From a paper:
Structural models are observed with a clear electron density, except for residues in the heavy-chain constant domain (Ala130H, Gln133H, and Thr134H of the unliganded isoAsp form, and Ala129H, Ala130H, Gln133H, and Thr134H of the dT(6-4)T-liganded isoAsp form), which are disordered in most Fab structures, and except for residue Asn28L of the dT(6-4)T-liganded isoAsp form. Figure 5 shows a clear electron density for the residues around isoAsp28L of the unliganded structure. In CDR L1 of the isoAsp form, main-chain hydrogen bonds are observed only between Ser27eL N and Tyr30L O and between Ser27eL O and Tyr30L N. In the normal form, these hydrogen bonds were not observed; instead, a total of five hydrogen bonds are formed in CDR L1. The tip of L1 (around residue 28 L) of the normal form adopts a type I β-turn, while that of the isoAsp form adopts a type II’ β-turn (β-turn classification is from Rose et al.). In the case of the unliganded structure, the average B-factor of the residues from Asn27aL to Tyr32L of the isoAsp form is 48.0 Å2 (the value of all protein residues is 32.6 Å2), whereas that of the normal form is 23.1 Å2 (all protein, 36.7 Å2). The high B-factor of the residues surrounding isoAsp28L would correlate with the loss of hydrogen bonds.
The monoclonal antibodies 64M-5, 64M-2, and 64M-3 are highly specific for the DNA (6–4) photoproduct, and have been utilized in detection and quantification. By the methods of tryptic peptide mapping, N-terminal sequencing, MALDI TOF-MS, and the PIMT assay, it has become evident that Asn28L in CDR L1 of 64M-5 Fab is non-enzymatically converted to isoAsp during the prolonged culture of hybridoma cells under physiological conditions. The conformation of CDR L1 of the isoAsp-containing 64M-5 Fab is largely changed by the formation of isoAsp.
Author numbering:
A (entry chain L): 1 to 27, 27A, 27B, 27C, 27D, 27E, 28 to 95, 97 to 214
B (entry chain H): 1 to 52, 52A, 53 to 82, 82A, 82B, 82C, 83 to 100, 100I, ...
The structure:
């Protein structure tokens, strides 16, 4: 159907660099008249989306000349020169004609040197056990880029049910990302197994980072 | 100035209905289309529909017909959206915005948004567990697990907030109507356990505050 495909989903850049966000319509965006209704909106954390560019290349009042847009037919582009700190957030193209539709969005992020995650695995606390629950926490902190995957192994056997994941937003201090993975079981199932393993796969290594412990050992 | 003030936060049960308002001031309410955009936690903007206050004409996205009901009160320059058969997927922030034409052709003014949560959970305090290193380097990672609470939010600090850097408090995850989250903190191994490290979790809704001092797992 006439969707709005926006790419890329994540656009990391160095402040001062130029950023280009693309948007392609599955059909030629008609003409609302001579104007072509394709807008660019920016949404910063905890805020409402805000108008950047309308009718493909017209800059909304108050918007810096650093932002400019262009394109025609099915391909449109938002160009941001000298990206600055306050420009970080999520951009959305929008087809305002016929069937109004938003693009998937593009997160303008900071680029930095790759960094391998520091992985920390923790067995259930005796307090949680006292109550009959069993959570095994694993942290994968300060890694770059954002892409990563976690796999849990209970006695060398992969486990994927009962796993809860969460990711922080880029760290405003070292520009890294961090993830938190929690495998939750019942005390009984947890006490029926000995080996607990958390293992991270990140581009910074051809081999996965493995953290683990055995319930018996203390 | 054009202004759009939206009704406040709402908690609703599945199957029920909710009605939020978008009060307009600063312009000729009956001359512009009012649009409604939906945003799910961490997700992208999604066009719901629009209504022209001048004659109540409405146009809805195929995905929302039967879900969103748009009305408008001329007398009070207020637009309304009513959602039916609420489900968990309706939980989201809902924005209203006026689409201008003339000086600009786009949604130039947006409301602050109305956060709607759909849940059958009742206030539940969180269980807090300490995450401490199991076996006896230079840097040490500690943490706390805040599990099974409702509703959001929860505040986590370390050493009453005096311990700020090296801290990662993760976004909560919804699992079977309840929320779970964690917070890690990495410090110099010459600081722990010689110096104290405590996480302070507070949960306003349930009038609860919990402190866990991290201690080695001897």
């Amino acid at each position: 159907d006439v969707l709005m495909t926006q790419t890329p989903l994540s656009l990391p850049v160095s402040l001062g660099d130029q950023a280009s966000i693309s948007c392609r319509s599955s059909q030629n965006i008609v003409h609302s008249x001579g104007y072509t209704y394709l807008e660019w909106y920016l949404q910063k954390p905890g805020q409402s989306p805000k108008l950047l560019i309308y009718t493909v290349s017209n800059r909304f009042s108050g918007v810096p000349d650093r932002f400019s847009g262009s394109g025609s037919g099915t391909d449109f582009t938002l160009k941001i020169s000298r990206v600055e700190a306050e420009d970080l957030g999520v951009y959305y193209c929008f087809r305002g004609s016929h069937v109004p539709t938003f693009g998937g969005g593009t997160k303008l992020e900071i680029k930095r040197a790759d960094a391998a995650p520091t992985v920390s695995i923790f067995p259930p606390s005796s307090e949680q056990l006292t109550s009959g629950g069993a959570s095994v926490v694993c942290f994968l902190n300060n890694f770059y880029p954002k892409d990563i995957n976690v796999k849990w192994k209970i006695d060398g056997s992969e486990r994927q049910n009962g796993v809860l994941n969460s990711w922080t937003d880029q760290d405003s201090k070292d520009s890294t990302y961090s993830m938190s993975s929690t495998l939750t079981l019942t005390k009984d199932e947890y006490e029926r197994h000995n080996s607990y393993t958390c293992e991270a796969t990140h581009k910074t290594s051809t081999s996965p980072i493995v953290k683990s412990f055995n319930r018996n050992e203390c | 100035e054009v202004q759009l003030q939206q009704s406040g936060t709402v908690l609703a049960r599945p199957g029920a209905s909710v009605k939020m308002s978008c009060k307009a001031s600063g312009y000729t309410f009956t001359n512009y289309w009012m649009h409604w955009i939906k945003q799910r936690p961490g997700q992208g903007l999604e066009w719901i529909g629009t209504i022209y206050p001048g004659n109540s004409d409405t146009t809805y996205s195929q995905k929302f017909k039967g879900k969103a009901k748009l009305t408008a009160v001329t007398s009070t320059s207020t637009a309304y959206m009513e959602l039916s058969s609420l489900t968990n997927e309706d939980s989201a922030v809902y924005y209203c915005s006026r689409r201008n034409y003339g000086s600009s052709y786009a949604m130039d003014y947006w409301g602050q948004g109305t956060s709607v949560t759909v849940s059958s959970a009742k206030t539940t305090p969180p269980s807090v567990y300490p995450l401490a290193p199991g076996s006896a380097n230079s840097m040490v990672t500690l943490g706390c697990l805040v599990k099974g609470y409702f509703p959001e939010p929860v505040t986590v600090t370390w050493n009453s907030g005096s311990l700020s850097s090296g801290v990662h408090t993760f976004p909560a995850v919804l699992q079977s109507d309840l929320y779970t989250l964690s917070s890690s903190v990495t410090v110099p191994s010459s600081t722990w356990p010689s110096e104290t490290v405590t996480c302070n979790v507070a949960h306003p809704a349930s009038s609860t505050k919990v402190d866990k001092k991290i201690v080695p797992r001897d």
